[PDB]
Amino acid sequence: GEELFTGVVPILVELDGDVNGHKFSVSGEGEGDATYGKLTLKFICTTGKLPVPWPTLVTTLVQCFARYPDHMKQHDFFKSAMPEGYVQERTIFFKDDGNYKTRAEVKFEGDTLVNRIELKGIDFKEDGNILGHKLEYNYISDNVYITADKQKNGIKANFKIRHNIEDGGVQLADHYQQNTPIGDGPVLLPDNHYLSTQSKLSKDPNEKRDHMVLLEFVTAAGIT
Numbered sequence: 001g002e003e004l005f006t007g008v009v010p011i012l013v014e015l016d017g018d019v020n021g022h023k024f025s026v027s028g029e030g031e032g033d034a035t036y037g038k039l040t041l042k043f044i045c046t047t048g049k050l051p052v053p054w055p056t057l058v059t060t061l062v063q064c065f066a067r068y069p070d071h072m073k074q075h076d077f078f079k080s081a082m083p084e085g086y087v088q089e090r091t092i093f094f095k096d097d098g099n100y101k102t103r104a105e106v107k108f109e110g111d112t113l114v115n116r117i118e119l120k121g122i123d124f125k126e127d128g129n130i131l132g133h134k135l136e137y138n139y140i141s142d143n144v145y146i147t148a149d150k151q152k153n154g155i156k157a158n159f160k161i162r163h164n165i166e167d168g169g170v171q172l173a174d175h176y177q178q179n180t181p182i183g184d185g186p187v188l189l190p191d192n193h194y195l196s197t198q199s200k201l202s203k204d205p206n207e208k209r210d211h212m213v214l215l216e217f218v219t220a221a222g223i224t
Contacts, residue, residue, distance in 0.1 A: 024047045024050055101120050129165055138201060142197060
């Protein structure tokens with residue numbers, strides 16, 4: 001499975017979302033180079049204006065592109081599930097606001113790594129930081145804490161994203177994650193570790209559609 005990642009791999013992302021009844025879709029394209037933990041992606045809202053902030057979608061919109069140090073390669077669940085892929089599910093609780101629930105299938109379609117996602121958001125405040133578009137657009141950086149889930153032959157993870165708000169404050173997004181293989185072959189069930197992830201958000205100055213450019217680095221850590 002890891003052999004599929006030694007070079008540059010094209011990526012396609014497709015998301016359908018509904019947040020407090022606001023429906024939208026996002027498409028993305030780019031490439032990943034797991035040797036360097038490196039992702040370059042561009043996302044477009046294909047239905048018009050995105051009804052939530054782009055930064056709140058970053059985590060939802062391919063952790064198989066993590067750089068695992070040589071000494072940790074036996075702990076890389078994500079690549080070990082390929083090419084058949086895995087189901088990635090989250091609940092994302094926005095403190096003092098609504099939540100997202102997401103279900104994605106991440107797998108190869110030929111030579112392209114595809115992430116197909118459905119997102120449902122409920123209980124948001126119409127004037128909160130999310131539906132009110134009060135978040136900064138710049139960077140997200142944090143650590144994804146992974147543990148084995150022997151019962152689903154997969155993994156769980158938990159992490160926090162501390163989104164900066166335009167007034168100087170913070171909007172916390174508490175993430176709970178589960179991944180389960182699609183296929184029936186052996187997978188690597190890891191010791192506890194984390195992915196150190198840095199996402200840089202930008203705009204394509206020639207792009208008139210509502211969009212997000214992402215440069216991301218993802219590195220496994222936490223084992224000696």
